[PDB]
Amino acid sequence: THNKYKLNYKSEEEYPDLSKHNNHMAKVLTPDLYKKLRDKETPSGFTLDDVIQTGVDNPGHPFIMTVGCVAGDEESYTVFKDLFDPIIQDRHGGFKPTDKHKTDLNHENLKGGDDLDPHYVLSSRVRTGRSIKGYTLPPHCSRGERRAVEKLSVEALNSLTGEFKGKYYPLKSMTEQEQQQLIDDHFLFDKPVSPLLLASGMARDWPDARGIWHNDNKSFLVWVNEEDHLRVISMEKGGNMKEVFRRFCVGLQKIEEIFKKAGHPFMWNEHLGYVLTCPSNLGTGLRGGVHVKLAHLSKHPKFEEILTRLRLQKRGTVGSVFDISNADRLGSSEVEQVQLVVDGVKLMVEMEKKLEKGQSIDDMIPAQK
Amino acid sequence: THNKYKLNYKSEEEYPDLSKHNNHMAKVLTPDLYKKLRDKETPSGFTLDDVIQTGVDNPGHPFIMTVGCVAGDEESYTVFKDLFDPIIQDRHGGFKPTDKHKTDLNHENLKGGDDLDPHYVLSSRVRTGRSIKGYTLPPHCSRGERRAVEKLSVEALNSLTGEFKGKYYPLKSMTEQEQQQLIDDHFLFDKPVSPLLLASGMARDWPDARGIWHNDNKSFLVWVNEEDHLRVISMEKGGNMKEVFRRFCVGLQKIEEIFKKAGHPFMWNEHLGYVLTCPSNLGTGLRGGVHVKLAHLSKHPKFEEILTRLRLQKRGTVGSVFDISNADRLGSSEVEQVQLVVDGVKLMVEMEKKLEKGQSIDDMIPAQK
């Protein structure tokens, strides 16, 4: 956006006013850091102003900190490491610039995911995101890049067979019937309404080159060109998390090898693992989650503390069902994260059964993991 | 946004999909025109993709056509004239590339604005917008440019005296009391919610360097760095449109001469008149309006046709009050536009008085102006 033209202004005159802001970007940005990085750019011309814009536009709420910045590029994380590195270290529990992310795509290293109590575990899912090397990320990508990402993705997905045979639904030419089926399948996405996403520029040209793919069994779902180039979900009613995770891993490997053959592998490096637009999703990008009925445990005074010790977190959803998933993303592997979900949920179901009988769970509260 | 990087893609691969669109941009853009202009840029790096983005994002509704493009720059209108010229010609009643806009800032050339019936005319207002030469327009301007626009504007406004003595209210440091006073004064603006405005990038860094100035008499109002660099309104209860227009003109002249002395005159040329972000506002940028009670005439079968013949238009607002203003912007002067409002409203009040008595108005229906 006229970077050499903006660089005619003094850094002070361009420096954002972040006095009311509560996000990770505003905590780290200083006048000196802005001055040092304002003249840099990635090979695709992504700038510091572009990385920080959503954090400038969205000061947020004192209760919760947002990240407040995006990568437009693989090399955004390097060119602007003096911004991203302290953000990453704060957001991801001390993960340092010299630390290494371990990736583990072997679902057989999972131990015991198959027997989660279906009276309590209503469903099991594992999701992640992926970027495709050679293309810039949604905040920045051109219509041509986004179209090339779609074409590669659909051709890969159309070639899968067996359990992974499926069909692609472009948002632009979706019929009302096809839309309505995807809504009550819970497979549809639409244009983001989040001001954090909109202010980053990722919703441009909507719905061009966005779409939905899913397999015939409706157990493996891919979203194309939404928040990241790809978002991949494996899901199942019940509690066979091991089977969900196998299908997740095998399905991703099949897409990965097609993309590698085309010279466009999944974006990855040994420091950050899989890179994606939002720094909070780095590493595994993985949210492995259950829906669990915790009628009694959710009322226990230590419910929040138990979740912390198990390194899990909850969001919203018969009766008092909770959407529980791993909190970690960077500095621990896909297997370790799903293992934490498996072990943690198994314990919390045991806790719930105890409270059903009026028995204390305090001896069951684990030490911090 | 990486223009040379986007220019590595073929023009076909970057060409927007506008098949579902109903805006002036989509009517004019062709593959050949996109290919010819995609590699151009203004001195501030504004590109064709930037001019058209809001029209790509907002296909709109079949009933009403939107413009679907913005200028980021004074020279956007020249660099991309092969896009803007046919849009302007369609939007502004045949106004050709070689035509000249006449500007007339002498309120004394108005004839007879003082005696509009106050039993029917509840209020009178004249608004316009202005851009400041040397700074890019809100879709594109940097925080430093926007801050410089504010500083120049406030210093000019703070120096006015007499009828035009006033005070500036920055949005960022506004107290609740100051806000609440401006709301029930009807002087406040906030962050735009229009997807047409948001998709153009003009709401970046909100509320930085936005604010409100008004005189002590609450009859002259200036908005800084909202849709355009300046939006200026003169208003009054009642029907002394001549006095509103005098105050409007004199207040603008006082701001104009300060800005000229600083080497930053109002942006203007002989072809387009005052230039602004939206092509529909070129020429005068002027919306001169009344609120009028037309209890009987608004029900007459020819109400819409009478408005057309008078070159006026209505929007929404005791009983059945209509917000009536001039439809023209480009190819006619400020005086001619307010004159059309004065003469047209006077006729429609006379029509209303006739219908109050059960008398026909057909002999009063004017020929097309």
Curated annotation (Swiss-Prot), chains A, B:
Q: Where does ATP bind?
A: 123-127, 186, 231, 287
Substrates-to-products reaction catalysed: creatine + ATP = N-phosphocreatine + ADP + H(+)
Residue limits of the Phosphagen kinase N-terminal domain?
6-93
PTM sites of type Phosphoserine: 159, 173, 194, 360
Q: What is its EC number?
A: 2.7.3.2
GO-annotated molecular function: ATP binding; creatine kinase activity
* Phosphothreonine: residues carrying this PTM: 161, 175, 308, 317
**Root EC class:** transferase
Please provide, in alphabetical order, the Gene Ontology terms of the cellular component aspect for this entry: extracellular space
GO biological process per UniProt: phosphocreatine biosynthetic process; response to heat
Q: Give yes or no: UniProt keyword Manganese.
A: no
**Mind telling me which Pfam families this protein's record contains?**
ATP-gua_Ptrans, ATP-gua_PtransN
Source organism superkingdom: Eukaryota
Query: Residues in domain Phosphagen kinase C-terminal?
Result: 120-355
Q: Which UniProt keywords apply?
A: ATP-binding, Kinase, Nucleotide-binding, Phosphoprotein, Transferase
Per the similarity annotation, which family is this? Belongs to the ATP:guanido phosphotransferase family.
Job description of the protein: Reversibly catalyzes the transfer of phosphate between ATP and various phosphogens (e.g. creatine phosphate). Creatine kinase isoenzymes play a central role in energy transduction in tissues with large, fluctuating energy demands, such as skeletal muscle, heart, brain and spermatozoa.
Subunit architecture: Dimer of identical or non-identical chains, which can be either B (brain type) or M (muscle type). With MM being the major form in skeletal muscle and myocardium, MB existing in myocardium, and BB existing in many tissues, especially brain.
State what protein this is by name: Creatine kinase M-type
- Taxonomic source organism: Oryctolagus cuniculus
